[PDB]
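TEACHING EXERCISE
Course module: macromolecular assemblies
Task: Read the component lines below, then compare them to the predicted structure of the full complex.
Student: A.B.
Group: 4
Components provided:
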Amino acid sequence: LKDQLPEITDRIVESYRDFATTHHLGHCPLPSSEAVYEIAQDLQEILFPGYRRRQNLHMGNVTYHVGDLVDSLHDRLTQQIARALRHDYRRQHGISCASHDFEALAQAKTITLLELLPRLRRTLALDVQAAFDGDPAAGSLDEIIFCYPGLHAVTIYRLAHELYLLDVPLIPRMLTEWAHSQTGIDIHPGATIGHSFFIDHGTGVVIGETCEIANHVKLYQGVTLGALSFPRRHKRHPTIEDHVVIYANATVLGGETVIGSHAVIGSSVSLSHSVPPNTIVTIEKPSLRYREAS
Amino acid sequence: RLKDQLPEITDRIVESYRDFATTHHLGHCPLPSSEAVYEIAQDLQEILFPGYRRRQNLHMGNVTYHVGDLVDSLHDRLTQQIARALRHDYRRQHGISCADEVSHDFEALAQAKTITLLELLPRLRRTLALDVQAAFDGDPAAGSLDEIIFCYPGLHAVTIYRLAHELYLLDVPLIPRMLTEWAHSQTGIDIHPGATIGHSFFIDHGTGVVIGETCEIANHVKLYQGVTLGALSFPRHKRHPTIEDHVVIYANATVLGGETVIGSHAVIGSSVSLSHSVPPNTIVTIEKPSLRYREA
Amino acid sequence: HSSGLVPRGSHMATDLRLKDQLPEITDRIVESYRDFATTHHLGHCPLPSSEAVYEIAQDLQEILFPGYRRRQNLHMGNVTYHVGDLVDSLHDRLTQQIARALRHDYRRQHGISCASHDFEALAQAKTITLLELLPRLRRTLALDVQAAFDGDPAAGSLDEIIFCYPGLHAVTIYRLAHELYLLDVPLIPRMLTEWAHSQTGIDIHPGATIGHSFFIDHGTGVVIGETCEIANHVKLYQGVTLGALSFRHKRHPTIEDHVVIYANATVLGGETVIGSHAVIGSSVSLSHSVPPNTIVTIEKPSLRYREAS
Amino acid sequence: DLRLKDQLPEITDRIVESYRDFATTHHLGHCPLPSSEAVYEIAQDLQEILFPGYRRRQNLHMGNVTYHVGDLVDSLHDRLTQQIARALRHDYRRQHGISCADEVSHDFEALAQAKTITLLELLPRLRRTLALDVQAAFDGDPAAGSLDEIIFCYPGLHAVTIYRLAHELYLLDVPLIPRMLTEWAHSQTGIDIHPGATIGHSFFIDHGTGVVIGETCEIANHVKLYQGVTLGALSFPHKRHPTIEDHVVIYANATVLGGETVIGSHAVIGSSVSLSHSVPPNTIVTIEKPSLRYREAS
Amino acid sequence: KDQLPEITDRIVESYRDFATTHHLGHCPLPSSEAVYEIAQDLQEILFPGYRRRQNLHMGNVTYHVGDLVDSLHDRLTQQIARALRHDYRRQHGISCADEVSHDFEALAQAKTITLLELLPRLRRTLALDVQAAFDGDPAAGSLDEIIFCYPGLHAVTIYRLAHELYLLDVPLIPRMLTEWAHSQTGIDIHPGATIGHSFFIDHGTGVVIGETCEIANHVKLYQGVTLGALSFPHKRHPTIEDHVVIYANATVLGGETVIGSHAVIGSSVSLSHSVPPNTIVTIEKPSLRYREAS
Amino acid sequence: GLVPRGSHMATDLRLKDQLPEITDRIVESYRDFATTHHLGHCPLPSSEAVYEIAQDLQEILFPGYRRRQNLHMGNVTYHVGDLVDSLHDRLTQQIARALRHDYRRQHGISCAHDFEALAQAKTITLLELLPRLRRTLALDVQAAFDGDPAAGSLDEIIFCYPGLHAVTIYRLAHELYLLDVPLIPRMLTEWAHSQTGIDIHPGATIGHSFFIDHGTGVVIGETCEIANHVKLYQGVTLGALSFPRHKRHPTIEDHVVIYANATVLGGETVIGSHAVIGSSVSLSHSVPPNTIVTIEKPSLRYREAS
Ligand SMILES: [Cl-]
Ligand SMILES: [Cl-]
Ligand SMILES: [Cl-]
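Instructor-supplied answer key:
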């Protein structure tokens, strides 16, 4: 009977006492996943108006739309950042929970992010053009903006990256993993990535925290820019110089691996050492076995 | 008091819209809506697989009402979306800007394409019935047709692809790629709407599969996760492979090139990377890998 | 018969008279339901609901990780209300969903048409079993969270892991699905794991057996088969397949304690055992056993280098 | 502060305890009563069927209306069945002092479905009646713009539509639901019609706020009422409310009381008239010209 | 369930038989819900900070207003056009025909712009109504309480919007608005009524004001007041002059009935003839009978 | 009805260029008429938050009759506990805004746990008296059953009798009034007034076993005092003298019935225990206990229709 339910409830609540690591019970709200996703939506509406939720934006009403989003983002970002800072401070110092202070610091950070939205749009315009240049078959800039997952993942990454530079805990990774969830493109928020970046297809792409990518680089599906199996904090991920292309399913590992300007890394190539500028690296023609099914 | 700087930030953002006009669409001419397109896709799937989607109370005595309503609504919504796609593509091809009255241009043409799509739904069900059976045939361990329809991501991605493909054949801009990229997002399966794919197609697992615009796949084919049917790095014009009937391609294989033909009943083994044709009834496998073993 | 632009009829609006054809389209669609009955479930026998299963999953996660999901205002003084309400609701919803799954499977197993046992009572028993083991699942998942922290040195905190590491999410859903699998619930286990698959690109069959302190880092492209058995303290990376040979019955590998399998490795076969503390390097493809304490890596690849022109 | 939040568990317990002490204003147990929201929803769907094009959907035409109606009928069948069954079961248990542990062995679902089918079957007839009501509003209001304006927003028509639905449920012995319907309409219009009232066709309430019509009241055809009219029972007293014959008009703030009061065919009851006795056909009843006092202001 | 298709068919049949109570065709009438939403938006413009949003300040209110004005332009145009088209067709016995029609659209837009243009003037009039409520209710807590919840103010606000639409010859919509307010307050004001500034209804339940009624400035009414037409009859409703107070349950009837400047109509007074300026009209004390109970 | 020329052209999109200017004139009007806005950084209480609070309180008072139908003794603690927790937060916030705004207004102060703590204390007081309120409301329910012999059941009364809804809201509002909460009490009674046409000032004092039958058009003034076992009908006014805080509305003693459309006026008017005020009676002075007041039989005119 339902008479068992109160007891099951009580055992679960008891388990909150026993295993305290997987709950946050108390008077100190962490940041909200949903609030961070909503922030992300609003930021994207500012960056690509006409391509998101509203389709009735024109020069005569866009100020009202942006103005309202900026006002709301100021409040929401401040709140979420403040909770991230408070929680991280408490955790670092082992302090328990029992417009000033962290709030003011959060607001300062929030305003910095909002102030760089014009600059971000400049950067993102070059990424859009990189997608157009990088995919000859592409219909239009509009198609790219609507639905190229590489552009979406990069957009989120660039927002998360700015917050990373501002020492915001939690929220950068929450943003990148949201994009990762939608696109299968996994970019650490600490990665440094220059303008005119394009990921085509993208599923399975992984880019590590200390990875440094210059301008005009293109990656394909399944590319890993990662750390070596064996032994921007301590550099453990590769540097990719300008105008590099890395084809599908390549792997590039190591904090000292530099892929030089204008290099091409062929499909399925696995590298743990530097490549000179102007080099095409490809796999040896595979040795395949053939048999008839009989 | 610091909220007083927000109006200035707002003005700088609006200014950036003048300076970088390539990444916005401001004006009196709505583009197609991602959300409306998604909703259309939901309604189409309701028609294709009733009893497996949102409603669970459908039977032969009420199904006409469900379908009839969806068909009527889809007529209106697809017409609207497709017309906006056609108008946008017209304006872009001609470099013309947005008019000062509301424009019904292309509405009749959009309606004609919409009706063609709705007319094909019975045929699409026939094809999808074979795909469903192909999943059951292709995965011994499958619990039932029901399980497949409910949650096999391959079937979902292919369903969206087949819808998008019909729109592609009708020269609808934007909407086909919007559909396949939606499916791509949900399944990790990346099928270009331009691909040609015969009946009884099955993708098992599916994450990381990529199939290019020009790829041609015949009947009774099965692929696994991480398969690429793609273009050569270097050496409507055909740049993607042709796969003949009854071929199976195992996990993480790569088949590249517009002149690569994989012959009837061939098997492409796991991790095989090919840029040349394979005759019928050939099993192609990698050379046993050379591995290094050491004590830790 | 001339025009001011390329396609003829560009000026014409929607012809509303053409709406008269829609009833016929509708009738042909309904006819196709008669002709191809395999891809619909029309009748008086609701199958389980995808949406209901998703909602159940949300509520289970709220119980497992309170404070990290939808509510942020939970404390020891109000958590009883939160849990008690969810347990009550889950009891009803899981019973309903499981009962429909059992009924449908029974009918399908036999010939029985929709026009036999007490499936509701059996469903409720299975539901109660699941709810009873939530404290135990919390214990397991606490170790998984710690394994993510240990397995990723660059990890910010337990908090960041719980909030957004996709491996933890996929493993949480899998562990719930697995218990339902062990209770012989049809449909629902795979519905759960495919949901997580869709969200993370991590594909765990609900039949897989996986010990505590399991960690998937990155994870996109991971596939684990039905009969795979993974021990304690195992760590996997993106693109790893633990699958079946191309060329009930065990068809998937066994991975022993403390094994690490790096990105894009493939391990195949029912008889393949990867031994305690082994390391399978990136892109390693194996269909045979490896002893304890063995590090397996690919041979340095043979690469061609030439000038880009 | 947050320390005071520690009192909330205790306040919660005081409330739960009070459910044990005062059981009459709660219904806790495993026997859901009917849902106000579900009844309101049913009413919305019924109105969609009766007045398509004037309610929620604006894209209905002869080519799609079968799908709309077919779907609503199907939904209503399930929801009305559920709501009626819950009402019947509760009323059974209450009348017999049974209680919710003790299983009901009676098939209220089948009976609820039968009552539901009866209501659905008479919707065509109800449309016939309501068509006459709409015309009566047009004929009864000189200033009326169109039938469309009337259908859209005349509160008299809305209250009467709900009443007519509630009345058929009343005649089918459905507990709770008929009064839930009429009270919803009362809430929206100020027009308070008991579901038991008997009202003929071509009925019109103009303005309507403050209208009260009692359970046993009987109104013929072509009757018109204004705001504030009471057709009620005697204060100092089975039929306890008046009978109004055809073609009667009753002006604002009139009061007509008593089970034996018959207002005769084509009578006119003037503004503010208060009556507790019958009136013959073709009689105009008015108040005596009031004696008013006039004084200069300061 | 086997009975249901037949019931469905008989209902559809009855649509053919009784065609006056449906609007089936290709010609959307106006939408009640769209009209209500338009009314919500207009109310937000008229009384910002007292409606749905509570975070409005001088720095963001332009964005809020600007956005609503932009949207209201589109939605009012659409609703008014549908009203004009339907009413014209109906008046002239024209049927729907099977073409999507821009008919009356430009005229609807014109009327819509005129309405939006007079919103500043409406605010000026309503500021006088709010003061009248404060003046007319000496027990009133604050202007805020009045604005928040005095039902007289809400009914008058709706009526004033409806009345401007009535003056613009917009069919259907004005009555839709006043009946909506009627439904929420028990106050029934025909949109055709003429009402001057500083108007106040206190309590209000049961107030009826007729189409041809004319009310001057500084007038106050109470619950249950009827300003109506004669039972035994183009002006059919009374004229109320400046500074008149009409107390609870009074009834004032007739097109030729003029209540003179500064008159007072006492509770329960029933009048069908003019009253001179500066006159206080009261009922004769009732003849009451008293008896001891038992 | 001349249709002006140009009427049938499509919307002219360049006319939207005028909308910014219209917007500016509207904003200007906020500067010119500042009494009818509340622009700034100090939000007032929200109508919708107050309504939601009211819904939650009603769920606590009448569980099984409102939004949830699956409540039983095994789960009701969870339901109530959660509502109380949420109410504590929301009532605290709303009350604090009421108190802050009222203080600023009463003094000159402009906008650039003090009130919060005071708000919380009042919120706790309200929540603590909910069991007592349920006792009182149970008596009101029973008074409706006793006072309307045709009533089907307590259930029906709870489900849909408007008098009981109006009175429920009034009793909640009245407790907030007694705690000197500005704004919110009148917001609550006006909401009830809107749904029922029953208009009760939050300051009214009303004893147990109170029933209003039908109710539309009832008005009860701020200083009115109503004892126990009182019944009112539709259209009853308990109001102030037109030509006369400090008592200006009547006192109604126990067991009084007032029938439809009666008017009782004046702060010194006391209607004695067990009196009956007949339909349409108008009274502006006291009547002793056990007095039955009726109007003289009306003098009516009858004529033949012509
Ligand atoms: Cl592709
Ligand atoms: Cl009516
Ligand atoms: Cl009106």
